[PDB]
Amino acid sequence: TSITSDIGMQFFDPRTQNILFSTDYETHEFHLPSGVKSLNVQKASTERITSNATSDLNIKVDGRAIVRGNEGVFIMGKTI
């Protein structure tokens, strides 16, 4: 169901006259939708990664892991 133009897709509910969805990204800022399972973003600025109180975080990667601490790293744990 392809579409094509210079600007792109649009949609706004006429009962609000607010653009509920657009694809001229420079104008309207994108927001995170609800109900998302995973997201694969090519660059992340994360303050903290944490799990929930049941299962284990797994920083797993087929590639190489390069963790660099500019002021230093501190590993705290029971069995390391």
Binding site: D13, P14, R15, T16
Partner: protein, 45 residues
């Protein structure tokens, strides 16, 4: 610090429909007719 002492009091800060009308689109109203009785007359003469 007495220089950054801030005082605040009360103030008086006080700052959906959808419809479109086209012109017309009526269908075939009164959909009934026949071409036999007149044919019978003009073939019975």
């Amino acid at each position: 610090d007495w220089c950054n002492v801030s005082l605040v009091d009360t103030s008086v800060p006080e700052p959906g429909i959808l419809e479109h009308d086209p012109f017309f689109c009526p269908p075939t109203e009164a959909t009934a007719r026949d071409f036999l009785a007149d044919a019978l007359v003009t073939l019975l003469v």
